[PDB]
Amino acid sequence: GIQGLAKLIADVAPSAIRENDIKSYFGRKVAIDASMSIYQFLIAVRQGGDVLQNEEGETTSHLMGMFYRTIRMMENGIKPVYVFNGKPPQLKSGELAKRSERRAEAEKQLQQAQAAGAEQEVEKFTKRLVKVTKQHNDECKHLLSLMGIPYLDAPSEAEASCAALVKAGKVYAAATEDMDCLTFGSPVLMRHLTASEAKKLPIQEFHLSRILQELGLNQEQFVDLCILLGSDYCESIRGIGPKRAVDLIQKHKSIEEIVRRLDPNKYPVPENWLHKEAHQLFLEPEVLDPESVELKWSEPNEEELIKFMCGEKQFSEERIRSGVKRLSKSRQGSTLEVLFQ
DNA sequence: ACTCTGCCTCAAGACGGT
DNA sequence: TCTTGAGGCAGAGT
DNA sequence: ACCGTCC
Ligand SMILES: [K+]
Ligand SMILES: [Sm+3]
Ligand SMILES: [Sm+3]
Ligand SMILES: [Sm+3]
Ligand SMILES: [Sm+3]
Ligand SMILES: [Sm+3]
């Protein structure tokens, strides 16, 4: 995302953050980042260091989490649409390689401590070596379709497509922890949305217009600010962080002017910088067309869900049947059936 | 006194009885 | 084949 | 709400 954007907004633009009870969101539509949910489920949903699976050796944690979390959201009257990632931008390749180094300095580290006998360490590095594959995304898509829950394939970054679904009024906000969703123009971002029987953090909304108001900036200047803070698509200036970049943009209003108004002896510019291409990518991303698909929450298919979850993935039939009943009853309570005119 | 580097470390769920 | 976030601290730079 | 368990 963006380096320490949430803290900056908290300290400088406190009015941009608003908190509301889960019970106030009945009847609202949200766009969820699915890949992040899958990472969460694959990391957390495990027992004894091993992930939930069937006899064929196939992971099922992502299905556990997707199923139950989705049902809970529906029970609270929240209608979600999962947005899946697409082709990553080439500007991100750099970052996409550095996150690979974090894996390189992990798999090799899972060989000396896996032979030493330290359980908890092995569990840690194993958790750090989790990667979401296409089989995960496809089994999740299948499950959602069997549940009647709509999903959309983004052409590139799912965060930008979410931002476009909000910009177009198709949903109210994007449920993601990806803060650069605000740089793609998402008028509202929602954090901490799980709706659990033992809830923890409060649901918080970041409103873009309030951010721009408190900072006294427009979308272009804000994108430049986020480029200076630390994006995933280009480099940041060495030695310039939040406090300095805020004043620099509040005073000079652009990166071009900043470069044309600084002493290179103190703050040098990165070699072969791509700040204009990142500015462009953020202001005008590759995004699906929201007017194409109209979102529908349809009746779940109970029989196929039993054959898939219980027959193939070996979930308990009682829990699944009761869950489907809960889902159909909540959808009954929150959605109006089709009216032909 | 601020502020940023540049490292280091860490983290990511839910159910059905009690 | 593709997700992210948050601190703490020594030390130099402002 | 805690805690063994989910697959
Ligand atoms: K920086
Ligand atoms: Sm992102
Ligand atoms: Sm199979
Ligand atoms: Sm190293
Ligand atoms: Sm089978
Ligand atoms: Sm009907």
Numbering used by the authors: 2 to 342
Question: Could you pull the original sentences from the published paper?
Answer:
In the hFEN1-D86N and hFEN1-R100A structures, the ssDNA (5′-flap) region of the substrate threaded through the tunnel formed by the gateway/cap. In the hFEN1-D86N structure, two basic residues of the gateway/cap, Arg104 and Lys132, were within 4–7 Å of the +1, +2 and +3 phosphodiester. In the hFEN1-D86N structure, we were surprised that the scissile phosphate was within catalytic distance of the active site while surrounding bases remained basepaired to the template strand. In striking contrast, the scissile phosphodiester bond was directly coordinated to the one active site metal ion in the hFEN1-D86N structure. Furthermore, the +1 and −1 nts remained unexpectedly basepaired to the template strand, which is shifted relative to the other substrate structures via a dsDNA distortion surrounding the scissile phosphodiester. There is no base stacking between −1 and −2 nts in the 5′-flap strand; instead, an unusual interstrand base stacking interaction occurs between the −2 nt of the 5′-flap strand and the template strand opposite of the −1 nt. In concert with the DNA rotation in hFEN1-D86N, Tyr40 is in a different rotamer conformation from all other substrate or product bound or DNA-free hFEN1 structures. The Tyr ring is fully stacked on the +1 base, and its side chain hydroxyl forms a hydrogen bond to the +1 phosphate. In the hFEN1-D86N-substrate structure, cap and gateway helices 4 and 5 are shifted 1–3 Å towards the dsDNA relative to all other hFEN1 crystal structures with DNA. Close examination of the hFEN1-D86N structure revealed a water molecule 3.3 Å from the scissile phosphate.
